[model samples]
Target: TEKLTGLYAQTLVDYSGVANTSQKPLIVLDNACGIGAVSSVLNHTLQDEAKKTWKLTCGDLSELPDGHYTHVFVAFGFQSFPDANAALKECFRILASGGILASSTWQNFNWIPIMKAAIETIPGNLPFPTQKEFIALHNAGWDSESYIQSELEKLGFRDVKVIPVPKETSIPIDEFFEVCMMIIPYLLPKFWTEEQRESHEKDVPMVLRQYLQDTYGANGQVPLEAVALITTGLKP
Candidate 1:
C-alpha cells in the first residue's frame, strides 16, 4: 500500500497544481498523511523557490484554522475517516476560497482476482466471497465517481471531479508473496476452523506465487496494477 500511496501522492500534487511556481506563497495541508509520503513528494516536486515559499503541515483536520490552506490533500484516506461527512465539511472549511481539495480512493486492485484464485485452490469447506463481495469489503462506497462527486457537491465544493488514475509497478515475486501472506487473514472469514486456517496458511503462499509466475512470467518480477480515483474540487 505504501507504493500505491506514493503513486497517488504524486498524482494528487500534480492535479492540484501545487508544484507550479506562484507569486503568492502556497500553504498545503497533508491531511491524514501516513509517514508523510504526500508531503515528501510535494517537497521533492516543487521548484527551489516554491519550496522556500510553500508551507506544509501534516496532521489531523480539527485544529487547523479556517480558510488557511491553499491546497488540502487527503491522500487515499477520505474513505477511512470515522465521520466522512464531518471530515469533508472540515476540508471544505479549512480550504481557502479557490483552493484545491484533492483526495484519492481505491477503484480496483489487480491482486484481488489473483488472491481469490490462489485461495480457492486450497480445498476447504469455508465459504469464499465472490470478487465483487470481496472488493466491497474494502472499497464499499468510495470507488464510485458519482457518489464522491455528489458528496463534494453537497459540501459546497464546485467543479468536483473523480478521475480514475491507473498505475502499474513491478515488485520481486518473493516480496509480493510476503504481502499476500499479510493480506490472507483479511481475505478469509473470521470463524475459520483450525484445520481450515492451517490448510490455507500452508498452501496459499505456494499457489499464489505460482499464479504470479504464470501470469507475469518467470522473470521473478510481479506486475501490480492499481486503479484509484483522484477526486478534486474547488473550494468556492
Candidate 2:
C-alpha cells in the first residue's frame, strides 16, 4: 500500500507539470505523513542538494501555513480525518494558486472484498465491513469520485480529475496476516473481549491460509491487488 501511494503521489507530481529546480524548489507537503513514505520516495529518488530545494514538511493539513506549498499529497490518509471537506479545504488554502492537491483512497477497491471475506470468518460472524453497500442502497448517490470532484470544484479548483490507481503485487500469505493484526483491532473495537479478539486474530490467518491452499494450491503465489482512486485538482 505504501509503495502504491508513493508511486501514485509521484505520478501526481509528474502529471502536474512542475519540476524541482534550484532557483524555485517544489514546496511539497505530505499531509498525515505517517511513516513518511512520501518523503522517503522524494529523498531517495530525487537525490541531490537540489532535493534540498524541496521544502518537504510533514504536518497536519488543517493547521498548515496558508498559500505556501507547490504540491500537496494525502496518501490514503485523507479519509482518516473527521471532516474530509474541511481537510481538503485546508489543503486548498495552503496550496499556492495553481498548485496541485493529490489524494489517494481505497474507494471500494479490490482489497475490500477480499478483506471482507477474511473478516467474515471470525468466530462470531463479526460485523466487519470494508464497504458500506447498505448505506449506498438508501442514499441516492454515494459516489466518492463525483463527491470529491464536486468538492474540489466548489473550492474554485480547476482541472479536477479522479482516476482509479491499480496495484499488482504479491504478499506472502503469512505476512498478510500481520497486516490483519494491525487492521482488525482497529476495525472492530469494543465488540469482542481481548481473548475473543485474540482467538479471531489467530483463527483468521489459518482460515485464510486454508482458503488460499484450496483455491490456489499450497505453494502457489497469492496474487494481491490494491486499488485506489487518485483525486487531483489545481487551485485557481
Candidate 3:
C-alpha cells in the first residue's frame, strides 16, 4: 500500500507544477502524509533553486496558518477524511491565492475480483456483498471524477480537473496475500455474528491462498492493476 501510494505521489508531483522555479520561495504541505510519500517524492523532484528556497511541511491538517502554503498535496487521502468538507475547507483556508491542491483516490483496484472470488470459494451461506457493493463501501465519494471535481468547485477552487491514471505493477504473491489478510477484517460486515467471523477468519487464508495460486500460479509474482483519480484545483 505504501508503494502504491508512492506511485500516486509521483504522479501527483509531476502534475502539480510544484517544481517550477518561482520568484518567491514555495511553501508546500503534504496533508495526511502517511509515511511522507508525497514529501519524499517532492524532496527528489523540486528544482535545485526551488529546493534551496522552498519550505516543506508534512503531517497533520490542523494548527496550520491561513493562506500560507503555495501547494497542498493530499495523495490518496481525501476520501478517507472523516470530515471531508472540513478537510477541504481547511485546505482552502491554508492555500494562498493561486495555490494548487493536488489529491488522489482509487477509481478501481484489480485485486477486488481476486478477493471476491477467494471469498466466494469459502463454503458458507454467509451473505457476501457484491464486488460493486464492496467497492462502494470502501470508496465513499472519491471514486467519481465528477464528485471530486464538483467538490473542488464548491470550495471555489478554479481550473479543477480530475483525471484517471491507470497503472500495473507486479508484486510477490506472499506480500500481496499478507496485505489481503490484513484487509479482510475491515471488509467483514459489522452485523455478522461472532461465530461467523471466527469461521470466516479460519477459512480466509486457505481459500485466498488457493485462489491466488490458481490465478497467479505457484510461488511467484502477481500483477496488480490500479486506477487512481488525480484531482487538481487552483485557489483563485
- lDDT (CA) per prediction: 0.75, 0.64, 0.78
Across 19-119, the per-residue lDDT of candidate 2 in tens digits comes to 54232567877676742654365444444544455677788764467888887877766666666677878888888876888777665544446667766
Tens-digit lDDT track of model 3 for 1-236: 66676777778888888876352578888875642743467766645652477887887773398899999988776667767778889999999988999988888887777687777777776655564566566436788888888888998999998999998788878988998888777777553578888767777888889889888879888777899998889998
Which structure among the candidates has the greatest TM-score? Answer: 3
**What ranges in model 3 sit over 4 Å off?**
21-23, 191-195
Candidate 1 lDDT, 1-236, residue by residue in tens: 57666777778878877767352578878875642753477766544543467787889863388888888888777666767777889999998887888888888887767677766666664555664565566436778899899889988999898899999987777777788878777765554667677666666667788887876677677778988899889987
lDDT of candidate 3 at residue 164, scale 0 to 100: 97
Predicted structure with the largest lDDT when compared to the true one: 3
Q: Which has the higher TM-score value, candidate number 2 or candidate number 3? A: 3
lDDT of 1 at 5: 69
